[PDB]
Amino acid sequence: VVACFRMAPLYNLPRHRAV
């Protein structure tokens, strides 16, 4: 269930998309 708990975060997200 840890896999379902872990999703895509901003720190893994690139810079410009987060901007």
Added chain:
Amino acid sequence: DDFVAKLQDNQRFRYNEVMQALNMSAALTARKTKEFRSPPQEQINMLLNFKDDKSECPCPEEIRDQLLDFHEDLMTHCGIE
């Protein structure tokens, strides 16, 4: 640019905190990891709640102050105040 860089570093450190918290307690971990489970737009919306005093955003007061100062300067340029 730099505001997002600091926010991403914040979330990086918060992930380490919650990943220890998972090994300490699994039942409580839901609310810890909800803001990672959320889609990125919802994550931004929850993280950008510095305004007013509801203050349920997990972001630290220094990062809140950075955005508050930038917003005051932007309002000053815009002529609102």
